[PDB]
């Protein structure tokens, strides 16, 4: 199961580090080794764009508060509620009760950056 | 029945020529870089050393691990099998050898080596009650850590010191 | 049937016969040549792919807040659920 | 070539060595070596020679150039003759039926004899353009045959040194 | 040759492209960047849509932040509704369907 | 006890609201006609057969009422999914007949293990595509829901 | 051929069945699980005593005129009624 | 209730790494991720021949003997 040793295990930084740096100096002169380039490349290609992941939302943060719904300990909760909504019709029998007519306000907002009245 | 997957030459008789040339392949006699020098005797070899061959020297070569094999049922002719894969790590692990690496290089092929599936239909079967699939794992790990970029061309310099052999199956 | 009994085999890197071991290897580029071009399916739809609840987003952050700086007052039970 | 690049005498003696030793170690017996890797090999090839070219007279480049032509010219040459064997075997076990049974068998191989004959006249005459190649010769063509042998009984010289 | 000669010889132009007459340096490039594309480029790509899904959803969601935030209502419902089915919750959508009802219903 | 089956509320409106036919453009036609059947166990999703009264109808495009303006959406989203049907055989085809092609000369096992593989990613392949040529990922969410209401519901008395 | 039941052959299709069979079922009844979900909340069966008198009312709250709306009983259960005016 | 910011880059940084390492895993640690290549070796490698007859080529022949090429 498996190829033949093409190279350094994952954990290996130091060993990966000189296949990906080959992969632009020296060309490869056979299948083997050229794979094995790409994928020791990929460690640090996939590791670089998790870095500016990472340094993107901590420089640039969302600005959402919804994201505190995906916290580890609410997934379980958030499973259970999309199994758990009330059983009906998507279509209203009845006119719902807001206090606030939200398309009315919004048509405002637009209209003139000013609440209604 | 005769072994299974085999040429049946006659009754129960196989055929099994590949197997032994296969055998031959992997070159199963000491190398040493210095000749023996004059006045010098048996080579050291302490207890523990000659304990590790314990359970790989006992094979009687009677090719039921091979033919149990799933993996030489669908490729004979380049799997080397868990008969000769046993035995290519007997010399490895062998303190006197001291061609290991080049023994390691040479094994080191999808082929020959890494048809093992771990399906232990070899340890199984085996009359003298060998491991072979423990031996083959063993020799998976040592390649896997000790391998290095130059071992290609280590190949390619024994075969060229094989250039002058005669017909049959060899290193090269 | 009967295999044809001439053969000119292969003598030298110059003198190549067509057999099926140069057929694979022309195999070998057109599957690989299939990546190239499947790969643009993935990148075409992280690059068109959009995630927005109506055509009001684009209106709110043209009129409520323009330069993306615009705090807004956080009232937790809102997206929180309770 | 087309090419800009430029390199010194000791930068092309590693580059031409470097691939001497890559095909000359590789195990040619498997097929899946040789489709993976040929394209490689060609690439490096073509730069290899046009940078080796002012020193194919050079006591150290020279040889090396020589013995890589050589080599590359067995390679093709052992897998053209390997490759018509594979064929031959394909066909007989597509001829034993589904299972080995016979269930769906295909029509079996009217002159396999002939065929040995032909291929092991050709293993000859490898042998005898490549003298210094035997290794990689009997690993590849001389194994094939060995693996025919089974199939069919046809003698060929170094029949007895495979245990036939 | 006739018609016949003009079909074969079209035929014959069409099918001229193969593999083999390609450079040994292209034959090469085009299965490097192959190999490149399926080790390198398919795993990254998810994590980049992975990247512009928080972003663009963030986006969406603040949006909504801001409205309520203009209107200073504590009606969250009338918001976002989180019991109803589907997309319904968003105050568009729950419009969309009051507007349904009152033009279907007497 | 017994279940009725009645049109939904946005059924009514376009009904009410239609002014004509509407032509059926080729690659709609190919599109119903390639979508797959939808047994109905229960209720709950539009079939090719509701799909095609949606395309049917005809509304005024410069009406202002918000009921037809709904309508107008919704068409546009169930119209955008027909159409996407189309990939789905191209893919297919392709999945199955250029890898045997690939694969001509080799065994009967190979054929059998890796054509059905590639026949279903070809077929991934092209609802891919079509999906995405016909712009259904830069639907918002209020299109999308709006082309996915139901066309039947079951009665709800008072 | 030979044949036995403890041939691999018979034995991996018998290790296979168990140990997939469980998995499959239950993966699959969860996702059947997940879209029930979503259905009920869709669109929720809902029982009526009497056809008649529930089709009447549907009419009368829609301003349907019976006269153009066709009513056919699918199976003993369900009963739907369809525009008779439709293209 | 009413907080004056709120703190998402834990929570999201979290979501990322946990969503990117086991894509990443799957994709590149098991060696199970190598399966496919292990059967066709097994299976499909070397087991072809150009002298038996197949479908494929049979229908692009007579396609183009049907055409007059
Ligand atoms: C195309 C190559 C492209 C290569 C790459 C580009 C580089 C090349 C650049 C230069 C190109 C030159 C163009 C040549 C035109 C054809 C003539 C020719 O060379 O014939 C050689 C040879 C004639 O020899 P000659 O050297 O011309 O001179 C002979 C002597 O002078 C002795 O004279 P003679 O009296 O014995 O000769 C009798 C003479 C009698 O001819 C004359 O009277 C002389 C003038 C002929 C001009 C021909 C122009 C093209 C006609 C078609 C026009 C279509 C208009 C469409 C308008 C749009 C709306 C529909 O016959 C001809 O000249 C042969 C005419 C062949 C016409 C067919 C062209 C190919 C098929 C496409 C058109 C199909 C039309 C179907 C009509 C059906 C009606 C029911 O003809 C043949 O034997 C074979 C004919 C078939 C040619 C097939 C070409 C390949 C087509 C497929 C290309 C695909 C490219 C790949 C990518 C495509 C992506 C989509
Ligand atoms: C109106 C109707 C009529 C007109 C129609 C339109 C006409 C337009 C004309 C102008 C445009 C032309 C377009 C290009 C077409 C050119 C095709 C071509 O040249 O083919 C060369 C090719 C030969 O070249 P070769 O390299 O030597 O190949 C050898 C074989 O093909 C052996 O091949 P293999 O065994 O290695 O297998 C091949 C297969 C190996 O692979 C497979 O088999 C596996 C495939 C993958 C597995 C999964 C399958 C899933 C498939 C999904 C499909 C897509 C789904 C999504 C889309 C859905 C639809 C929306 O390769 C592939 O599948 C690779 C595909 C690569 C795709 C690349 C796409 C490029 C995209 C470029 C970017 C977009 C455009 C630019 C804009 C960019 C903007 C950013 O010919 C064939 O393939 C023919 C094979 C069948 C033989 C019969 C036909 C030929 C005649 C032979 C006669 C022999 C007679 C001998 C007689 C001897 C005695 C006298
Ligand atoms: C459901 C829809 C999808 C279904 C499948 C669709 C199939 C079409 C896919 C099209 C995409 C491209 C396909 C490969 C292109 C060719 C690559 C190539 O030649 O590279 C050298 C290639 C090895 O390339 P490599 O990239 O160095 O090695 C890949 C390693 O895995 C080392 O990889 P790594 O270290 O870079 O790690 C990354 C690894 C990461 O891999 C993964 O992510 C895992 C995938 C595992 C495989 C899953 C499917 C297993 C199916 C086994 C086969 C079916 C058995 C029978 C069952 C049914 C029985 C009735 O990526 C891969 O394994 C490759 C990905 C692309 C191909 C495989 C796609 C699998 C899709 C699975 C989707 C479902 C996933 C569910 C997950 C559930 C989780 C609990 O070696 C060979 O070609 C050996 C051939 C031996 C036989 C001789 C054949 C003639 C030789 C002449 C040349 C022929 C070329 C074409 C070969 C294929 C002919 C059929
Ligand atoms: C030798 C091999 C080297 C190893 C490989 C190294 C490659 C690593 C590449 C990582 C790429 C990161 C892409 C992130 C994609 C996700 C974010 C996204 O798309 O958002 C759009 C974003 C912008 O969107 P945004 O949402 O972040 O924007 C918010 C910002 N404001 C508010 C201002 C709008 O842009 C980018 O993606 C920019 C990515 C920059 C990544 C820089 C990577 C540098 C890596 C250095 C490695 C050095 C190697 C040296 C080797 C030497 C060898 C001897
Ligand atoms: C030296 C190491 C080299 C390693 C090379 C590794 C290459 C890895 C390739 C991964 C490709 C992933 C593509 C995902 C699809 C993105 C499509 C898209 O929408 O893009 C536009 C968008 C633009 O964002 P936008 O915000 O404008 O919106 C576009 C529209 N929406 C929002 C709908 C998506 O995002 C990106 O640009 C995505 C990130 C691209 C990152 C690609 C890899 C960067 C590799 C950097 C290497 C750094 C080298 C270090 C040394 C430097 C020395 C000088
Ligand atoms: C240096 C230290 C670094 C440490 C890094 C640690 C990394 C690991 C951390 C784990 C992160 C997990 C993030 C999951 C994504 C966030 C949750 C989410 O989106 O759910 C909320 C979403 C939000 O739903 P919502 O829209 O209802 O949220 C609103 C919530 N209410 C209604 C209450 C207002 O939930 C759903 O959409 C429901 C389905 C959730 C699906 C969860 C997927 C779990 C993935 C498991 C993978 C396991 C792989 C390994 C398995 C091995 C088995 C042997
Ligand atoms: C060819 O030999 C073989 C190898 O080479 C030695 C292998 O390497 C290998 C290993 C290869 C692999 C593991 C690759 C993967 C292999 C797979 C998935 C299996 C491939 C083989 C097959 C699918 C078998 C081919 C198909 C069949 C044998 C058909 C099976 C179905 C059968 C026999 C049912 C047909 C029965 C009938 C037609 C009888 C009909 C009955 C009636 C009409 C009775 C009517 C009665 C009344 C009352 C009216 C195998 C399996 C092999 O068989
Ligand atoms: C022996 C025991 C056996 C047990 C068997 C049963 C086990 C059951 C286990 C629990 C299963 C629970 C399944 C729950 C599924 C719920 C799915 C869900 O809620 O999804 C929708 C829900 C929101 O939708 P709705 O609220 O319906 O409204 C529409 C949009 N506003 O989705 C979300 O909120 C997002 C979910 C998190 C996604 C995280 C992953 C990131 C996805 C995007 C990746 C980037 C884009 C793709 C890039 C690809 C590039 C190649
Ligand atoms: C190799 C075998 C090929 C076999 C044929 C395959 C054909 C595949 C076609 C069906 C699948 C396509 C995807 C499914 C459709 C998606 C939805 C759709 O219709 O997309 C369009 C957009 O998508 C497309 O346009 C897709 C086009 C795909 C074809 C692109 C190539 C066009 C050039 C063809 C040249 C043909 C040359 C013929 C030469 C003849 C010589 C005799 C949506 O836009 P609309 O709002 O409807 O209106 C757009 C314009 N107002
Ligand atoms: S069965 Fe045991 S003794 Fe016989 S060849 Fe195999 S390992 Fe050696
Ligand atoms: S049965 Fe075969 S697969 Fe390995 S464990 Fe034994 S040699
Ligand atoms: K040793």
Same mark, same amino acid.
């Given at each position: 199961?498996?190829?033949?040793?093409?190279?350094?295990?994952?954990?290996?930084?130091?060993?990966?580090?000189?296949?990906?740096?080959?992969?632009?100096?020296?060309?490869?002169?056979?299948?083997?080794?050229?794979?094995?380039?790409?994928?020791?490349?990929?460690?640090?290609?996939?590791?670089?764009?998790?870095?500016?992941?990472?340094?993107?939302?901590?420089?640039?943060?969302?600005?959402?508060?919804?994201?505190?719904?995906?916290?580890?300990?609410?997934?379980?909760?958030?499973?259970?509620?999309?199994?758990?909504?009330?059983?009906?019709?998507?279509?209203?029998?009845?006119?719902?009760?807001?206090?606030?007519?939200?398309?009315?306000?919004?048509?405002?907002?637009?209209?003139?950056?000013?609440?209604?009245? | 029945?005769?072994?299974?997957?085999?040429?049946?030459?006659?009754?129960?008789?196989?055929?099994?020529?590949?197997?032994?040339?296969?055998?031959?392949?992997?070159?199963?006699?000491?190398?040493?870089?210095?000749?023996?020098?004059?006045?010098?005797?048996?080579?050291?070899?302490?207890?523990?050393?000659?304990?590790?061959?314990?359970?790989?020297?006992?094979?009687?070569?009677?090719?039921?691990?091979?033919?149990?094999?799933?993996?030489?049922?669908?490729?004979?002719?380049?799997?080397?099998?868990?008969?000769?894969?046993?035995?290519?790590?007997?010399?490895?692990?062998?303190?006197?050898?001291?061609?290991?690496?080049?023994?390691?290089?040479?094994?080191?092929?999808?082929?020959?080596?890494?048809?093992?599936?771990?399906?232990?239909?070899?340890?199984?079967?085996?009359?003298?009650?060998?491991?072979?699939?423990?031996?083959?794992?063993?020799?998976?790990?040592?390649?896997?850590?000790?391998?290095?970029?130059?071992?290609?061309?280590?190949?390619?310099?024994?075969?060229?010191?094989?250039?002058?052999?005669?017909?049959?199956?060899?290193?090269? | 049937?009967?295999?044809?009994?001439?053969?000119?085999?292969?003598?030298?890197?110059?003198?190549?016969?067509?057999?099926?071991?140069?057929?694979?290897?022309?195999?070998?580029?057109?599957?690989?040549?299939?990546?190239?071009?499947?790969?643009?399916?993935?990148?075409?739809?992280?690059?068109?792919?959009?995630?927005?609840?109506?055509?009001?987003?684009?209106?709110?952050?043209?009129?409520?807040?323009?330069?993306?700086?615009?705090?807004?007052?956080?009232?937790?039970?809102?997206?929180?659920?309770? | 070539?087309?090419?800009?690049?430029?390199?010194?005498?000791?930068?092309?003696?590693?580059?031409?060595?470097?691939?001497?030793?890559?095909?000359?170690?590789?195990?040619?017996?498997?097929?899946?070596?040789?489709?993976?890797?040929?394209?490689?090999?060609?690439?490096?090839?073509?730069?290899?020679?046009?940078?080796?070219?002012?020193?194919?007279?050079?006591?150290?480049?020279?040889?090396?150039?020589?013995?890589?032509?050589?080599?590359?010219?067995?390679?093709?040459?052992?897998?053209?003759?390997?490759?018509?064997?594979?064929?031959?075997?394909?066909?007989?076990?597509?001829?034993?039926?589904?299972?080995?049974?016979?269930?769906?068998?295909?029509?079996?191989?009217?002159?396999?004899?002939?065929?040995?004959?032909?291929?092991?006249?050709?293993?000859?005459?490898?042998?005898?353009?490549?003298?210094?190649?035997?290794?990689?010769?009997?690993?590849?063509?001389?194994?094939?045959?060995?693996?025919?042998?089974?199939?069919?009984?046809?003698?060929?010289?170094?029949?007895?040194?495979?245990?036939? | 040759?006739?018609?016949?000669?003009?079909?074969?010889?079209?035929?014959?132009?069409?099918?001229?492209?193969?593999?083999?007459?390609?450079?040994?340096?292209?034959?090469?490039?085009?299965?490097?960047?192959?190999?490149?594309?399926?080790?390198?480029?398919?795993?990254?790509?998810?994590?980049?849509?992975?990247?512009?899904?928080?972003?663009?959803?963030?986006?969406?969601?603040?949006?909504?932040?801001?409205?309520?935030?203009?209107?200073?209502?504590?009606?969250?419902?009338?918001?976002?509704?989180?019991?109803?089915?589907?997309?319904?919750?968003?105050?568009?959508?729950?419009?969309?369907?009051?507007?349904?009802?009152?033009?279907?219903?007497? | 006890?017994?279940?009725?089956?009645?049109?939904?509320?946005?059924?009514?409106?376009?009904?009410?609201?239609?002014?004509?036919?509407?032509?059926?453009?080729?690659?709609?036609?190919?599109?119903?006609?390639?979508?797959?059947?939808?047994?109905?166990?229960?209720?709950?999703?539009?079939?090719?057969?509701?799909?095609?009264?949606?395309?049917?109808?005809?509304?005024?495009?410069?009406?202002?009422?918000?009921?037809?303006?709904?309508?107008?959406?919704?068409?546009?989203?169930?119209?955008?999914?027909?159409?996407?049907?189309?990939?789905?055989?191209?893919?297919?085809?392709?999945?199955?007949?250029?890898?045997?092609?690939?694969?001509?000369?080799?065994?009967?096992?190979?054929?059998?293990?890796?054509?059905?593989?590639?026949?279903?990613?070809?077929?991934?392949?092209?609802?891919?595509?079509?999906?995405?040529?016909?712009?259904?990922?830069?639907?918002?969410?209020?299109?999308?829901?709006?082309?996915?209401?139901?066309?039947?519901?079951?009665?709800?008395?008072? | 051929?030979?044949?036995?039941?403890?041939?691999?052959?018979?034995?991996?299709?018998?290790?296979?069945?168990?140990?997939?069979?469980?998995?499959?079922?239950?993966?699959?009844?969860?996702?059947?699980?997940?879209?029930?979900?979503?259905?009920?909340?869709?669109?929720?069966?809902?029982?009526?005593?009497?056809?008649?008198?529930?089709?009447?009312?549907?009419?009368?709250?829609?301003?349907?005129?019976?006269?153009?709306?066709?009513?056919?009983?699918?199976?003993?259960?369900?009963?739907?009624?369809?525009?008779?005016?439709?293209? | 209730?009413?907080?004056?910011?709120?703190?998402?880059?834990? =929570?999201?940084?979290?979501?990322?790494?946990?969503? @990117?390492?086991?894509?990443?895993?799957?994709?590149?640690?098991? $060696? #199970?991720?190598?399966?496919?290549?292990?059967?066709?070796?097994?299976? =499909?490698?070397?087991?072809?021949?150009?002298?038996? @007859?197949?479908?494929?080529?049979?229908?692009?022949?007579?396609? $183009? #003997?049907?055409?007059?090429?």
């Amino acid at each position: 199961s498996g190829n033949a040793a093409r190279g350094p295990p994952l954990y290996d930084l130091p060993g990966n580090f000189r296949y990906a740096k080959e992969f632009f100096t020296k060309p490869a002169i056979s299948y083997g080794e050229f794979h094995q380039q790409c994928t020791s490349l990929r460690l640090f290609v996939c590791a670089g764009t998790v870095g500016y992941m990472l340094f993107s939302f901590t420089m640039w943060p969302c600005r959402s508060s919804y994201w505190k719904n995906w916290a580890v300990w609410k997934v379980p909760g958030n499973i259970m509620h999309h199994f758990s909504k009330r059983s009906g019709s998507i279509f209203l029998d009845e006119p719902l009760k807001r206090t606030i007519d939200v398309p009315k306000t919004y048509a405002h907002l637009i209209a003139t950056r000013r609440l209604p009245g | 029945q005769p072994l299974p997957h085999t040429y049946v030459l006659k009754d129960l008789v196989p055929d099994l020529s590949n197997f032994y040339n296969q055998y031959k392949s992997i070159e199963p006699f000491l190398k040493r870089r210095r000749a023996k020098q004059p006045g010098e005797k048996e080579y050291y070899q302490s207890i523990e050393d000659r304990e590790k061959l314990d359970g790989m020297y006992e094979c009687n070569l009677c090719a039921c691990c091979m033919t149990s094999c799933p993996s030489y049922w669908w490729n004979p002719e380049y799997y080397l099998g868990p008969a000769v894969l046993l035995q290519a790590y007997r010399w490895i692990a062998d303190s006197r050898d001291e061609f290991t690496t080049e023994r390691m290089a040479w094994i080191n092929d999808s082929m020959r080596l890494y048809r093992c599936h771990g399906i232990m239909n070899c340890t199984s079967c085996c009359p003298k009650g060998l491991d072979p699939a423990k031996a083959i794992a063993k020799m998976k790990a040592a390649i896997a850590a000790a391998y290095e970029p130059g071992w290609t061309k280590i190949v390619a310099q024994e075969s060229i010191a094989n250039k002058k052999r005669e017909s049959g199956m060899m290193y090269a | 049937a009967r295999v044809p009994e001439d053969i000119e085999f292969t003598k030298n890197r110059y003198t190549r016969r067509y057999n099926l071991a140069t057929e694979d290897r022309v195999k070998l580029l057109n599957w690989n040549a299939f990546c190239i071009a499947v790969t643009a399916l993935p990148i075409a739809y992280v690059y068109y792919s959009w995630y927005e609840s109506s055509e009001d987003t684009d209106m709110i952050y043209r009129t409520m807040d323009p330069m993306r700086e615009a705090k807004a007052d956080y009232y937790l039970p809102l997206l929180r659920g309770h | 070539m087309l090419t800009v690049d430029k390199f010194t005498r000791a930068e092309a003696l590693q580059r031409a060595s470097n691939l001497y030793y890559q095909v000359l170690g590789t195990n040619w017996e498997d097929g899946l070596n040789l489709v993976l890797d040929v394209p490689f090999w060609e690439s490096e090839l073509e730069k290899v020679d046009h940078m080796c070219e002012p020193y194919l007279c050079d006591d150290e480049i020279g040889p090396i150039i020589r013995n890589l032509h050589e080599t590359v010219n067995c390679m093709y040459a052992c897998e053209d003759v390997r490759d018509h064997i594979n064929e031959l075997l394909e066909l007989s076990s597509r001829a034993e039926g589904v299972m080995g049974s016979g269930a769906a068998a295909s029509e079996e191989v009217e002159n396999m004899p002939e065929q040995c004959g032909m291929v092991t006249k050709a293993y000859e005459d490898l042998l005898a353009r490549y003298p210094e190649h035997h290794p990689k010769i009997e690993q590849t063509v001389g194994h094939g045959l060995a693996v025919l042998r089974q199939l069919e009984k046809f003698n060929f010289k170094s029949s007895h040194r495979y245990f036939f | 040759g006739g018609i016949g000669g003009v079909w074969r010889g079209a035929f014959e132009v069409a099918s001229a492209y193969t593999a083999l007459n390609l450079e040994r340096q292209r034959f090469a490039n085009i299965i490097r960047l192959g190999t490149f594309c399926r080790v390198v480029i398919w795993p990254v790509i998810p994590l980049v849509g992975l990247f512009h899904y928080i972003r663009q959803r963030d986006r969406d969601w603040y949006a909504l932040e801001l409205l309520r935030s203009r209107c200073k209502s504590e009606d969250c419902a009338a918001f976002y509704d989180w019991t109803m089915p589907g997309s319904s919750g968003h105050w568009r959508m729950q419009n969309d369907l009051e507007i349904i009802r009152r033009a279907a219903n007497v | 006890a017994n279940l009725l089956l009645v049109p939904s509320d946005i059924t009514i409106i376009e009904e009410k609201n239609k002014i004509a036919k509407r032509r059926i453009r080729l690659l709609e036609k190919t599109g119903l006609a390639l979508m797959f059947p939808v047994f109905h166990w229960r209720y709950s999703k539009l079939d090719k057969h509701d799909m095609y009264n949606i395309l049917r109808r005809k509304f005024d495009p410069s009406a202002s009422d918000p009921a037809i303006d709904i309508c107008r959406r919704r068409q546009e989203s169930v119209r955008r999914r027909v159409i996407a049907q189309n990939g789905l055989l191209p893919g297919l085809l392709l999945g199955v007949s250029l890898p045997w092609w690939s694969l001509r000369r080799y065994n009967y096992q190979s054929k059998l293990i890796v054509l059905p593989f590639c026949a279903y990613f070809g077929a991934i392949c092209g609802r891919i595509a079509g999906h995405g040529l016909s712009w259904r990922w830069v639907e918002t969410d209020r299109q999308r829901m709006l082309g996915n209401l139901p066309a039947k519901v079951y009665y709800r008395p008072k | 051929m030979m044949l036995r039941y403890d041939s691999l052959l018979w034995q991996c299709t018998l290790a296979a069945g168990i140990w997939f069979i469980p998995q499959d079922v239950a993966a699959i009844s969860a996702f059947l699980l997940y879209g029930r979900s979503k259905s009920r909340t869709i669109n929720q069966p809902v029982y009526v005593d009497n056809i008649d008198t529930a089709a009447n009312e549907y009419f009368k709250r829609k301003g349907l005129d019976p006269t153009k709306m066709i009513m056919m009983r699918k199976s003993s259960k369900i009963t739907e009624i369809r525009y008779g005016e439709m293209y | 209730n009413k907080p004056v910011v709120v703190n998402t880059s834990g =929570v999201v940084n979290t979501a990322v790494l946990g969503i @990117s390492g086991a894509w990443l895993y799957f994709y590149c640690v098991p $060696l #199970r991720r190598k399966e496919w290549y292990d059967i066709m070796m097994d299976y =499909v490698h070397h087991k072809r021949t150009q002298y038996a @007859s197949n479908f494929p080529d049979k229908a692009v022949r007579t396609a $183009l #003997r049907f055409a007059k090429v």
